[PDB]
Amino acid sequence: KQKNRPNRLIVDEAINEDNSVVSLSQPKMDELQLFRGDTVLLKGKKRREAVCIVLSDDACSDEKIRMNRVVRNNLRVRLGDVISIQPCPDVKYGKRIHVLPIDDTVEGITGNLFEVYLKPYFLEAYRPIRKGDIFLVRGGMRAVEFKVVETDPSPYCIVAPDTVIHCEGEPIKREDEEESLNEVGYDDIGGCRKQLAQIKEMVELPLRHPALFKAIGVKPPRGILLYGPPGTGKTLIARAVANETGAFFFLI
Amino acid sequence: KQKNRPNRLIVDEAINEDNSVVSLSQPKMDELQLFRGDTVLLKGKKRREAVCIVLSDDACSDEKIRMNRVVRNNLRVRLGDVISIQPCPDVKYGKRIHVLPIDDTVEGITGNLFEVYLKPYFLEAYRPIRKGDIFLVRGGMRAVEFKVVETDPSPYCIVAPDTVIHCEGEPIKREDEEESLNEVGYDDIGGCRKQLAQIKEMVELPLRHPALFKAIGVKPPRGILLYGPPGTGKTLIARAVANETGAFFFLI
Numbered sequence: 309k310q311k312n313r314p315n316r317l318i319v320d321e322a323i324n325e326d327n328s329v330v331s332l333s334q335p336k337m338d339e340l341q342l343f344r345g346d347t348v349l350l351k352g353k354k355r356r357e358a359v360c361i362v363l364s365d366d367a368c369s370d371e372k373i374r375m376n377r378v379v380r381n382n383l384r385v386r387l388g389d390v391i392s393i394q395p396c397p398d399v400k401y402g403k404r405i406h407v408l409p410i411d412d413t414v415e416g417i418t419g420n421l422f423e424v425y426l427k428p429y430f431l432e433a434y435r436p437i438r439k440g441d442i443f444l445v446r447g448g449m450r451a452v453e454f455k456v457v458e459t460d461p462s463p464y465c466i467v468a469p470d471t472v473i474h475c476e477g478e479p480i481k482r483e484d485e486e487e488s489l490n491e492v493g494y495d496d497i498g499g500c501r502k503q504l505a506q507i508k509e510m511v512e513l514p515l516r517h518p519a520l521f522k523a524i525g526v527k528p529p530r531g532i533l534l535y536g537p538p539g540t541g542k543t544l545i546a547r548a549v550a551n552e553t554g555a556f557f558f559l560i
Numbered sequence: 561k562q563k564n565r566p567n568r569l570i571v572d573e574a575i576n577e578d579n580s581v582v583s584l585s586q587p588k589m590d591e592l593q594l595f596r597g598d599t600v601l602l603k604g605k606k607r608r609e610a611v612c613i614v615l616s617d618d619a620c621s622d623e624k625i626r627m628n629r630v631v632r633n634n635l636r637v638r639l640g641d642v643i644s645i646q647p648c649p650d651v652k653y654g655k656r657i658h659v660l661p662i663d664d665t666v667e668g669i670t671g672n673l674f675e676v677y678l679k680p681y682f683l684e685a686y687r688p689i690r691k692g693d694i695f696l697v698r699g700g701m702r703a704v705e706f707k708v709v710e711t712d713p714s715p716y717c718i719v720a721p722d723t724v725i726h727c728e729g730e731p732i733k734r735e736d737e738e739e740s741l742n743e744v745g746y747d748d749i750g751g752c753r754k755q756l757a758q759i760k761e762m763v764e765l766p767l768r769h770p771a772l773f774k775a776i777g778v779k780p781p782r783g784i785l786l787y788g789p790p791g792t793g794k795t796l797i798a799r800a801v802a803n804e805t806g807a808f809f810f811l812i
């Protein structure tokens with residue numbers, strides 16, 4: 309079976325903000341035999357899957373794939389990891405969905421969540437979904453998460469205008485496996501691109517591949533000193549780096 | 561029943577010093593069908609009532625009502641609250657009243673309180689009263705409070721020249737519900753208007769509506785630093801703010 313050359317890419321940062329658009333470059337797209345708007349299927353770590361509409365861009369390489377933080381966290385991968393891509397031409401429109409909120413997120417929210425949040429989200433935008441994911445909607449000076457529990461053409465479909473939604477039930481608990489989305493990441497840092505590039509390349513090898521430094525005698529850098537006027541967000545950059553590499557973070 | 565548009569106003573600061581004059585603007589006054597000098601009836605928090613002569617002014621909005629600190633404290637409301645207004649054309653002259661002092665206020669006062677204090681107060685000024693209120697008279701380098709206990713056309717009337725007063729009895733105790741009137745308020749701060757406006761708008765939302773900051777993620781200001789030469793009354797301003805919002809005050 310052929311899997312190495314047509315079906316391998318490397319995750320990196322995103323430029324678009326939609327939680328379903330995955331951006332890649334045109335040579336890979338006519339190599340994969342995929343056109344714009346076609347729903348694609350991604351497999352990552354721990355046999356997790358995701359369905360996403362595709363899009364083309366130019367400011368990419370021929371092995372890099374740009375995905376948003378929600379879809380990336382939905383596959384359990386981190387930046388610099390590899391995934392598998394496939395065409396999925398057998399998705400159908402749904403006829404029944406059931407969604408729940410996360411209790412950690414809904415606090416002091418009064419009224420009904422349906423007509424304020426889930427009504428403008430699935431409005432005039434055909435969005436694909438798979439059972440057991442988590443998506444995020446922003447508004448009312450808050451950001452609320454939602455977990456899909458069921459799907460009528462199980463286990464994945466596309467949201468069509470005539471797809472009823474039964475938003476019935478009580479909040480569900482966040483388990484000890486997925487991480488929160490109110491945490492810090494590289495997307496929550498405006499400006500300062502060159503310095504971010506430097507720090508990212510400076511801690512890439514010791515924190516991503518730790519076993520490599522048992523096979524070579526080479527000393528990686530261990531002392532970093534950030535400086536600048538107060539109010540420039542340095543602890544932010546620290547927590548960001550520490551969260552995106554999955555490393556442990558202690559604060560003195 | 562119609563109550564929202566003709567019978568709702570918002571309390572604010574006063575410009576006059578009389579304990580019976582309540583000031584409002586001419587559009588609301590000819591909307592309520594009220595003329596000058598007519599006794600008006602106010603209902604506030606905890607089904608408290610008050611009878612007051614009315615007056616017109618121009619430096620107001622069309623939903624703000626200016627009342628003195630005595631009448632405001634008599635309704636249990638604070639600044640920025642809402643009250644109900646009504647016309648009360650069925651007040652009559654009294655024929656017997658009975659008033660007592662507050663023991664916390666009378667200290668070292670010798671002689672009789674009647675002819676020195678209660679004689680010039682109800683002199684050539686028709687003043688309305690209701691049973692169970694508290695009013696304040698100034699003189700002799702002191703300020704003495706008085707509580708009405710009974711009224712002959714019960715439970716409210718107007719003081720006419722031929723209304724006898726039986727100032728008979730012993731001092732009464734201040735209970736644990738009403739606050740004193742020798743405390744600090746915005747009226748006891750001369751000058752410094754712009755800075756007062758700034759500090760009042762800076763602590764309005766967190767201290768008046770605390771539940772609102774469980775429904776939005778927005779950080780209110782928490783650090784304030786007052787400065788100026790010594791002798792400019794800064795702790796005064798602090799106690800003032802803390803008393804007018806009803807907040808707890810700790811002093812280090």
Ligand SMILES: Nc1ncnc2c1ncn2[C@@H]1O[C@H](COP(=O)(O)OP(=O)(O)O)[C@@H](O)[C@H]1O
Pocket residue numbers: 496497498499500538539540541542543544
């Ligand atoms: N470049 C930036 N991008 C995003 N937010 C920033 C940036 N610079 C400052 N801030 C914001 O202002 C504050 C500045 O960071 P700082 O007060 O030094 O860190 P912290 O209080 O989190 O230890 C943070 O709350 C952050 O939200």
Ligand SMILES: Nc1ncnc2c1ncn2[C@@H]1O[C@H](COP(=O)(O)OP(=O)(O)O)[C@@H](O)[C@H]1O
Pocket residue numbers: 748749750751752790791792793794795796
């Ligand atoms: N603007 C003002 N309005 C009213 N009284 C003031 C003003 N400025 C100063 N004072 C008076 O002078 C004193 C100045 O305040 P201060 O001596 O700093 O506070 P305290 O002695 O109460 O700790 C107070 O007793 C106050 O009565």
